[PDB]
Structure 1
Amino acid sequence: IMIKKPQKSKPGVFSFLDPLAYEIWMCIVFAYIGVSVVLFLVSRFSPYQSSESTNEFGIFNSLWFSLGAFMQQGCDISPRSLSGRI
């Protein structure tokens, strides 16, 4: 069989995400959505008025905490409860 010598490639626009498979990226996002929701569910427990408004992890903030941890640039918010810090 005579085919042409393989032209090597051009690396794609979306080839920065090439060392990690198509499986693992959505599993990061499904881990991203999972961890960010749960800390919101944790931080809106432990009241002891502003007892249930004590700690500042809204559902949009709990995304923003779980996003900043993934990009390694940490944000201002930090968990105060024990089950929040786990």
Structure 2
Amino acid sequence: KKPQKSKPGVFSFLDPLAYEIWMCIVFAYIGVSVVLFLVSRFSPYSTNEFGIFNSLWFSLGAFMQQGCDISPRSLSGRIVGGVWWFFTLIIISSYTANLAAFLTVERMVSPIESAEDLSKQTEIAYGTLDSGSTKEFFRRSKIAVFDKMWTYMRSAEPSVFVRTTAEGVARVRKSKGKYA
């Protein structure tokens, strides 16, 4: 069956950025908040406004583009606040620009492209017509790939084999891409 537009996954909103980027954002989030708590502690400049619970809230507000109530008042704190603002400006701009690429240009890919891919998967069933030279080819084949395909098609429940050509085409159109 021709590849078409499919059901989107529940977590498809995080598709424009790769999974190694999303884990590095979390790891950099914790790293800045630990640094901002430590340097504010032993270097005071009165009340310790930036605690470990406050520093997590400050860095969470800067990433989510919202404002925060408290601001750093020391030179070493404001450098940490300055660079982390520049980090979030690039990443949010990169997320917006990549979605504009996806929604404009639609490219669809087929799952399989060769017979050796069908042998190495169990998601999609495949079968032939019951009487003819096509089934007889896979029966007496000593090729290692074709011998693997015959062991699957023989011991398969329900039966992959069909009666006629038109019945075989009808199963392709109605199995939603699960039959070849």
Same fold, judged at TM 0.5 (above)? yes
CA–CA separation in structure 2 for the residues paired with 1:17 and 1:66: 21
RMSD: 1.4
Query: Could you list the runs of 5+ residues in structure 1 that have no partner in the other structure?
Result: none
Post-superposition shift, 1:7?
3.0
Residue 39 (1) aligns with residue 32 (2): no
3-state SS, counterpart of residue 42 of structure 2:
coil
Match of 1:55 in 2: 48
Post-superposition shift, 1:37?
0.8
3-state SS, counterpart of residue 78 of structure 1:
coil
CA–CA separation in structure 1 for the residues paired with 2:30 and 2:11: 22
Query: Normalising by the residue count of structure 1, what TM-score does the alignment of the two structures yield?
Result: 0.82
Structure showing greater Rg: 2
Post-superposition shift, 1:35?
0.5
CA–CA separation in structure 1 for the residues paired with 2:2 and 2:44: 69
- Give the length in aligned residue pairs: 78
Post-superposition shift, 1:11?
1.9
CA–CA separation in structure 2 for the residues paired with 1:45 and 1:54: 13
Deviations 1:11-53 (A, max 9, x none): 21111111010110000000000001100011112235xxxx5
Report runs of 4+ in structure 1 exceeding 4 Å deviation.
Answer: none
Aligned 8 A contact 1:32 1:66 in 2: yes
CA–CA separation in structure 2 for the residues paired with 1:45 and 1:84: 12
3-state SS, counterpart of residue 14 of structure 2:
coil
Post-superposition shift, 1:8?
2.0
CA–CA separation in structure 2 for the residues paired with 1:41 and 1:32: 15
CA–CA separation in structure 2 for the residues paired with 1:31 and 1:17: 18
Aligned 8 A contact 1:39 1:84 in 2: yes
3-state SS, counterpart of residue 62 of structure 1:
helix
Q: Percent identity?
A: 100
Structure number with higher helix proportion: 2
Post-superposition shift, 1:54?
2.8
Within 5 Å, which residues of 2 pair with 1:5-44?
Answer: 5-44=2-41
Query: Normalising by the residue count of structure 2, what TM-score does the alignment of the two structures yield?
Result: 0.41
Query: Could you list the runs of 5+ residues in structure 2 that have no partner in the other structure?
Result: 79-180
